[PDB]
TrEMBL record, chain A:
Protein name per Swiss-Prot or TrEMBL: Flagellin
Protein family membership: Belongs to the bacterial flagellin family.
Shown residues within the full chain: 2 to 50 of 495
Signal peptide: none
Subcellular location: Secreted; Bacterial flagellum
Functional description taken from the UniProt entry: Flagellin is the subunit protein which polymerizes to form the filaments of bacterial flagella.
Highest taxon in the source lineage: Bacteria
Organism: Salmonella enterica (Salmonella choleraesuis)
Length: 49, 46
């Protein structure tokens, strides 16, 4: 295991951090705007109705 | 006696050791197990 050419754990943590950032941003935008829908992503039927 | 056959034997052993030494230094330097084709073809291809 004593190798340096690539540190797997680092990239693992980076992936988890990206996940965290996406979720955090979504939640903060929801709170700030006060809605549940800020884009077509949130809910198609919701936007239509 | 013109030559020390045991000295010749020792020379052979010397080269034997040096080859593995150089290989270890190679791997330490590169940070890789494989540095050439004749290390492992399947590993290189994969």
């Amino acid at each position: 295991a004593q190798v340096i050419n690539t540190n797997s754990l680092s990239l693992l943590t980076q992936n988890n951090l990206n996940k965290s950032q996406s979720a955090l941003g979504t939640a903060i935008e929801r709170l700030s705007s006060g809605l549940r829908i800020n884009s077509a992503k949130d809910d198609a039927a919701g936007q239509a109705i």
